[PDB]
Design a protein around this ligand. Structure first.
Ligand SMILES: [Cl-]
Lengths: 208, 212
């Protein structure tokens, strides 16, 4: 099978820049196709037959190449271009796809908007105490979160989940969930979520 | 507009069988080759089946050959994938696709996809808990199987300020959360409801956001 090696794996670029992502084939290919995928939706046809833009694909996008090396170029990158780009061939059977280039956009640093939430009444009655903290719309993607209970850092039972880059504001978001049982949660009073790229902290007191 | 709507995805045991459907419209279905492509949880895309206009010729990669059978019904304009001898590596989002009579083997139209999960775990409906204290609100969607769930806020009229956190699997069950941000004059002065659908359990759970 023609193996497609896509480079780079992550292309980090600021808006206004010209970028090029590359698709190398183990063997010669007659036509290369490109798809754009944003999270929560299927791949969208983006370039077909090496050069042609799919409908509703901006003119900033171009495609090129031949033989065993193809490229997709963006003349001036915009925030809405953040997504994964996959090349695909079907010159020989089977058809194959590259592993994708994820285009990440740069922008100004942004502090997270931090929100901490106490467990609902429903949950505590069912013996559960999930304490949730959102760190929304921050940049860059690398951020640390720490939990403190009654002033002590707590590490066990913290599960973090990151979004992909927002297409509109080029920011990331993340949820940090401290999973306690009601029994554990009711032993303490002060619950703190701290963000560090000097931190941003948010707290609640159970007794309030 | 060309439409491709997959259905029939869901939970199935290793060694078991599941049959996907794809309802096509907006083109003369019986003039086109049709395909299935899947995307693994590692986000890799792989072609899994090709079928003829008339369903007389079928082609498959070695990994599914003997296990999956592509068929089509040109009267009802449905495309099908009977999957058998399922393995956990078949866990994936499955897309039906349409090419072009222009050749060149592009995938010119894709469905939205249906998730197939190969697992011995049970279907479990979620527990939905409001996350209440611009003001940010959330709903915690806890202890469900399999994927997926969808959270809508006031019937979609608040979608622009929404974050959807990827589900994490823990003790055989998924947990995810959704956040929404609204003006402090919008809530609590108005009601904010999260609506959580889990098709696998045919459940829809609504929770009102109210101060703790
Ligand atoms: Cl929504």
């Amino acid at each position: 099978q023609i193996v497609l090696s896509q480079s780079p794996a992550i292309l980090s670029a600021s808006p206004g820049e010209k970028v090029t992502m590359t698709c190398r084939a183990s063997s010669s290919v007659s036509y290369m196709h490109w798809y754009q995928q944003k999270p929560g939706s299927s791949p969208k046809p983006w370039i077909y037959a090496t050069f042609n833009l799919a409908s509703g694909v901006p003119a900033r996008f171009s495609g090129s190449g031949s033989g065993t090396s193809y490229s997709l170029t963006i003349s001036r990158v915009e925030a809405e271009d953040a997504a994964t780009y996959y090349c695909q061939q079907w010159s020989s059977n089977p058809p194959t796809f590259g592993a994708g280039t994820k285009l990440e956009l740069k922008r100004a640093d942004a502090a997270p908007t931090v929100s901490i939430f106490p467990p609902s009444s429903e949950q505590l009655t069912s013996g559960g105490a999930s304490v949730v903290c959102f760190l929304n719309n921050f940049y860059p993607k690398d951020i640390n979160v720490k939990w403190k209970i009654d002033g002590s850092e707590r590490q066990n039972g913290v599960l973090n989940s990151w979004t992909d880059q927002d297409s509109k504001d080029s920011t990331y978001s993340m949820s940090s969930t401290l999973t306690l049982t009601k029994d554990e949660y009711e032993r303490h009073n002060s619950y703190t979520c701290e963000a560090t790229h000097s931190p941003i902290v948010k707290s609640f007191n159970r007794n309030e | 507009e060309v439409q491709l709507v997959e259905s029939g995805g869901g939970l199935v045991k290793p060694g078991g069988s599941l049959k996907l459907s794809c309802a096509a419209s907006g083109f003369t279905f019986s003039d086109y080759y049709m395909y299935w492509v899947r995307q693994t949880p590692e986000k890799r895309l792989e072609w899994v089946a090709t079928i003829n206009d008339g369903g007389t010729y079928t082609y498959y990669p070695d990994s599914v050959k003997g296990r999956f059978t592509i068929s089509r019904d040109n009267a009802k304009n449905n495309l099908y994938l009977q999957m058998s001898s399922l393995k956990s590596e078949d866990t994936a989002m499955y897309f039906c696709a349409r090419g072009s009579q222009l050749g060149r083997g592009e995938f010119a139209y894709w469905g939205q996809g249906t998730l197939v999960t190969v697992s011995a775990a049970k279907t479990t409906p979620p527990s939905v808990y409001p996350l209440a204290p611009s003001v940010t609100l959330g709903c915690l969607v806890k202890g469900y199987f399999p994927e997926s769930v969808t959270v809508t806020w006031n019937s979609g009229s608040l979608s622009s300020s929404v974050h959807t956190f990827p589900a994490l699997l823990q003790s055989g069950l998924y947990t995810m959360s959704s956040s929404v941000t609204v003006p402090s004059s919008t809530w609590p002065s108005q009601t904010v409801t999260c609506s959580v659908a889990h098709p696998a359990s045919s459940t829809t759970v609504d929770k009102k956001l109210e101060p703790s």
